[PDB]
Write a protein that binds this ligand. Structure first.
Ligand SMILES: O=C1N=c2ccccc2=C1c1[nH]c2ccccc2c1NOCC[C@H](O)CO
Ligand SMILES: O=C1N=c2ccccc2=C1c1[nH]c2ccccc2c1NOCC[C@H](O)CO
Lengths: 311, 312
């Protein structure tokens, strides 16, 4: 009764736009089929995400088959729709804007990773954008999990475009580092205007990665998955020959630092925020970039913080 | 339900209140379990959800269970002002005025916060006032009797309780205001000083007479302000608190009490102005957090008032 129903946004349930009958405000409703016997993992993660670049939990309740109704913060557009529109119009997303989106993405992921939480399905359909601010917010934690580093996961993550290579190799001991590969993939697509690594199967997807970044060495295979083994030998290619003809060197340098085979070697989110590619954001439309919460300040290293911040 | 382990009982008041433990983090919380239909809203949860303040008990978690029950997990504080009050009497000592001021200051800050939202507690009493001994932090809990007052709509006069109701409630008022909480604070302040409650009595008349016997018969203008729908008592002159309260009592204590226990609901000192009252000049001159105002708090405290509240 408290929420009047709006447009369906996407379909174990459905996602709608709803309105608070009392305040007038607009929120997002996720209605999922659910037994009040068991916990809901997604609700349980939501409950802990209090960050400016992450979608906030507002309310939740049960209904009538029994359903859990999660009411969340709303943002009016997805990076998927923005990206498709630029292609449609015939032009490239300005690099200045790409940097704005990608910085905020890094900030979000930095925050969930300081809690051991991994998203596992970062994609442009999951990156909410505000046209008026250029604010970006990470949503949908239906596929997320708190990784317990002393404990093995089962390899059951299948998806196009954005999986880390270690997931394609059936890794059992993957880490939140997987998200960092996704960011890289999003970042590249934004630049190129189409995804980096297509393919319907894991083999297909692996081959495409190899085709661009070269065959992984043995040391690289172990570090991705020590439980797994031979491909043909292909040399790495230069991103400057893959990406479109205008692409800034700083953009490619950061990209090189993200898309590494060795999960442990991928750039740290706060490190990436301190990367010269964001130097023009530090030199003062722009949303909030430097309003760190007292939690974030407790977590960012002092060397790093000083390089992230403006003079 | 597995997430929390029981759980010493804290009070069976439509449900129970227990101590519970987060089996993942090890932290201790308070569980309020109430009999509830998931067909209706629960008013108390809806209020909890909006209370974000250092001197009010925070909501933590909530879930359903099986007769169907709503389970409210809240911030926990290990003691009540009632137990503290009731222990000082045992030892044959009075609560230091310096301590009394610590608690009552925080109480005002809490009330200041809920009234900025139109939320009225409606049952403030030392049993509802949680105190932590490490720190002298006080927190206001248990909003099961709270309501958001919609100034343009009447309420129904069905509030019956001992010691702490505003005179307007005793008079069957239908248009009462969050001011009723300030009357309760005054009473609590008073009781802390005196060693026993100010206004005893099992019925409404009984409660009114006691007030009238200390504060004097209300004038006609004071009756209209408490309840313009209500008519004679015998004429009694006000007594002077200096002769009711114990021999030592500081004059600023009484000054502050006088400014809370007015018959005219609209004249009762407002909470921020009370923190500015000189009775708290020693906390300023000189103990928990007192001056760490939230961005929200800062935006609704008036300018001149704020400066009087803060230390120099
Ligand atoms: O604002 C949103 N908050 C959410 C929380 C969880 C899941 C989705 C959203 C939100 C969406 N905002 C949008 C604005 C324009 C278009 C779509 C959306 C949102 N959701 O997208 C549908 C979910 C789909 O199944 C995968 O993301
Ligand atoms: O810490 C508490 N949080 C609460 C939220 C709602 C209702 C009660 C409490 C809490 C109590 N903490 C205590 C510590 C010692 C003794 C009692 C309590 C709490 N409540 O006990 C029942 C409330 C009753 O109104 C007063 O006895």
């Amino acid at each position: 009764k408290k929420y009047s129903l709006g447009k369906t946004l996407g379909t174990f349930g459905i996602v709608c736009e709803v309105f608070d009958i009392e305040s007038g405000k607009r929120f997002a409703l996720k209605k999922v089929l659910q037994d009040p016997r068991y916990k809901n993992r997604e609700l349980d993660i939501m409950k802990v995400l209090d960050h400016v670049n992450i979608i906030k939990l507002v309310d939740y309740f049960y209904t009538t088959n029994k359903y859990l109704n999660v009411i969340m913060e709303y943002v009016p557009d997805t990076l998927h729709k923005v990206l498709k529109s630029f292609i449609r119009s015939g032009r490239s997303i300005p690099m200045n804007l790409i940097s704005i989106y990608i910085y905020q993405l890094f900030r979000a992921v930095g925050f969930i990773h300081s809690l051991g939480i991994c998203h596992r399905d970062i994609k442009p359909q999951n990156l909410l954008v505000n046209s008026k601010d250029n604010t970006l917010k990470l949503c949908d934690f239906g596929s997320a999990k708190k990784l317990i580093p002393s404990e093995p996961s089962v390899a059951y993550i299948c998806s196009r475009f954005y999986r880390a290579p270690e997931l394609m190799l059936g890794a059992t001991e993957y880490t939140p580092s997987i998200d960092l590969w996704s960011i890289g993939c999003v970042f590249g697509e934004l630049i190129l205007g189409k995804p980096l690594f297509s393919g319907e199967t894991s083999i297909d997807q692996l081959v495409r990665i190899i085709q661009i970044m070269g065959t992984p060495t043995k040391e690289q295979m172990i570090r991705m998955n020590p439980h797994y083994v031979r491909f043909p030998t292909l040399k790495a290619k230069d991103w400057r020959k893959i990406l479109p003809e205008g692409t800034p060197s700083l953009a490619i340098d950061l990209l090189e630092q993200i898309l590494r085979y060795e999960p442990d070697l991928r750039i740290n989110p706060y490190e990436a925020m301190a990367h010269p590619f964001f130097d023009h954001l530090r030199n003062s439309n722009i949303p909030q970039l430097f309003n760190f919460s007292p939690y974030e300040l407790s977590i960012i290293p002092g060397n790093v913080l000083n390089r992230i911040l403006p003079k």
